[PDB]
């Protein structure tokens, strides 16, 4: 087994809500955060979680810091429900949902402008919950779910009710794990995201390939290019707006053909940057006198 | 019929030395030739194992990967009588990118030299030695010709700074630039990981047409 | 004089033999 | 101090080349694989390497296996250049590049019909190298560069030269590392890929959204959706092709506005599948009589 | 904007505080024994800097 | 308790003086060097001395070397006056000032053709002395004052007296110190110097800034720029010489306004060079036809 | 030297029609070396010899 | 390319005490041609001008 | 492994000192 830790991570921000946003006692659950290893994409414990079968938190204490002045007050309670199918989201009494919270072992009760910790209480036996993304039964791969219950209305400096919901703090997990049986653990968790949307250049002489260098990206990282445009009249004068963008190093094409007989908006480019976060691609137009602007998205894996 | 020639997994460290080599001569200069403070630098000798073409140690240095000077004392020998006088200061700076050649003060370049550890100050009609100061940590340095950074391949640079006008027997200034002596090293190395070091191959070709 | 120093600036290369059957 | 291993990781597949593909002595280098831990994207050692700063191989023995019959013949020599900047590519003689190989300590030559290994020679000192992509100097981040040199023309059983570039085996690594300084390494070492392309459905009622359920994707992974359509005559009948695609779960609006006065082919949908590898989105057309097909591309990060 | 702070909190010895609270951050030293060079910067920025705050 | 040493530091160069330069017995004192640690500006011991309050030399042996041939002759006597206020300068007899020297314990006489040393006599008690510049009383900040007295007319090889003041050697210190109380000592012990003077370029276009790149300076050090121009007839033709110099990196505006109604020769540019010892600034002239040269002085701290 | 004495035949007893690289040669050596000298042709140096 | 040629120009003379050259094939048992391998000791005996 | 072979492919150069009088 590999015993990694201790280390820190980032879970979420927490948004304490006002009186009007709490209508049912089920609304008091601010966060429902599963404390499996594989449930915080982009963090360090989740990236490590996809390289082993099984995990077990030896010591996993979740920590809260406030991001709020000392002139607003709202008492929280914070607990780690070890059963991941026990669900407090359907309790009708607003005091019973917080008696259910404070009676959990290792729960902590704090005003939300005060930094505190909550420890996860480990099992008496030796169970290794599985890593990776969720499956059929939710009791095989989660060791706990983190809850923060708002037990009191949010208040101002003068004792009157706050009328707007407020992002108030952040949660940080200080953890210690075992792992076992290295796998690559398929269905990876790296979510893709549009990095930026930058548009093509408008060359002068038609039928000529030119080099458009786009800068300010990440160095030596592979990207993905998809064509786009927005609200353009491709029939403003004579000629058919035909564009073709090809990289000088990468793979693929981009085709912008606004022929009204056969219209084609397709193609993609996989190209990576140099050590400066820059790259270049060959833009050609069949009618460069037509100055309809055209964009292209840059798809990149964020983490 | 399957056959193989796998070399073993061992790393032989070959401790060569002590032998002695010649570095360069040193040209003292007149007060007429000293305009900038960077004119007072007489020699600027890199002390890599691959930095003395002609010696056997530079020949043998490109048949291992890395080196480390265990003992390196450079021994100035004069070739001049006791009738001319000029004061040198000799040291081995351990950073190969600290360069005194961009100092605008003539007194600061000679306080740069005497404050280095292991420096030895002498009249140049007298034979004196300068020992290399080894690092505290155990660092090896790559052999061969210099790549992108000198800090991977040079352990030191020998400098000789001139601090006084070159005077004669009559107390008058010498008006010529005058070669004055030689420099010999007394060395002791390790060498690790034998490799043919591909820049050592003699080969005539055309690189690039510009 | 002449002296014969056993120079120790070399390295070995031992040869191993094998060979695959038809099946 | 975070020692992990020993494990196994697949580097690359080695492709032996034909006799006509060998022209210069530089063309005998089959693979030039840097043995930094952050240089095998998708494998287990590279995924781990992006979560520590420094490393050092304690034992990196690279294990080659054949994928070729015993009836064809060729001969390889294989070594690990400890200096990452000693480049054998500028050697103009064909025999000098393979004497460059066997002179390096720890090298090995073999017939490519059998399984042989090359160990990595340790340094004399204790130096750690950095993970992540190679920023400025290779001597900080690479411990070795694996080479395989082809020394023999690729023959077959029939006494002829193979005329095609042939994949001839695989390279595996038996690795044992240290690490230090847990962190994230801002450049992501993953690569994105257009997973598949499938067209929008054709709704029957104008201005009413019918939900398109797509299947066949991986369970519980996040995807990105960008439109792409090729050679469609939208002016073959009356009306304007106006599409609006929204997920019922994720975020984003794909908009297709083929009005030739104001053209808008833009937007992107971020959505993740359920536990069954399916998701669904609201497809609506303003003019349902226009049956010109429009597609979209499913972007996903593979590793 | 969340990945730049997940990259921050996962660094060893990082600290998370409201900015009206005094706290400390320790530098974690290397496992080996490297002496970075003193003096002003040069060609490679990994020879003369031990960390960036 | 911060014990540093032993090291070596160059104090000064000693200049022997001719027979006509010796008039009074006070004129035989060649050097009167205070041996406070804060009294050798630019050296290593003085740079360290400005970062502690107190010190004490454990061993300060001052090592003289010759810089002179063995064919000329003169004789020195050299001592360290432990009292910093006992001044030998008011002695009216020529032999009494050198009997003052050899009577001090730890003194030494020598021919100036050889290398001799003078050690510093320790006190009987344990007294620390202060660093920094000498504020009020010398008995707090100076441990000794090094003297060298010339006792012999400076002869040459040719049997003649040297008629010129001759630099005859150098003084080095082999020092070993304690320190206490780390601090900064508000007076800086460095000296500034006009590094070089170089003129502004002559721009060709009126009112358009062309960038002047200057080289040859030290890398990555901060400089100060003040204008200075000498004997320029600005009224030799029509127009008004109006210059404006701004760095692209630093801060400040050098303004040259040679309108004889309102004269403004003012301003200063603080800028630092790049890694290559170069910097650049925007030079612009309102009347580009006026080709009268204007310079600037590059100020830098040398030590 | 390596001399070829027979036509290059295949499995079917027919002649091979191509020139075929076939193997490698390794030496297993043991030397003396006397009188260390830098051997002036070993010096790497680019110059122009002779204009013809 | 070998280290022995690199190290050979740092002494004056040599003598091979033991020198055995070991042919390694890279070919199966399905093609056949007969070689003969030798080391002639005279470097000016050349078989390249034999008409038989 | 690592091994430290005392390489014996060097040669010494011992230094002797003297010096002439005036007569
Ligand atoms: Ca799993
Ligand atoms: Ca230095
Ligand atoms: Ca090398
Ligand atoms: Ca890094
Ligand atoms: Ca190498
Ligand atoms: Ca980092
Ligand atoms: Ca330095
Ligand atoms: Ca003070
Ligand atoms: Ca006194
Ligand atoms: Ca003070
Ligand atoms: Ca013969």
Coordinates of C-alpha atoms and ligand atoms in Angstrom, one line a residue, chain D residues 52-54 130-133 135 183 185-186, chain E residues 46, ligand 4:
Chain D
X52 CA 5.2 16.5 -7.4
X53 CA 8.0 18.9 -8.4
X54 CA 11.1 16.8 -8.4
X130 CA 12.1 18.5 -12.3
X131 CA 8.8 17.2 -13.6
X132 CA 6.4 19.0 -15.9
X133 CA 7.0 20.0 -19.5
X135 CA 10.7 24.8 -20.1
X183 CA 2.0 20.6 -6.2
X185 CA 2.3 21.9 -12.4
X186 CA 0.1 24.4 -14.2
Chain E
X46 CA 16.3 27.8 -11.8
Ligands
LIG4 CA1 7.6 22.3 -12.1

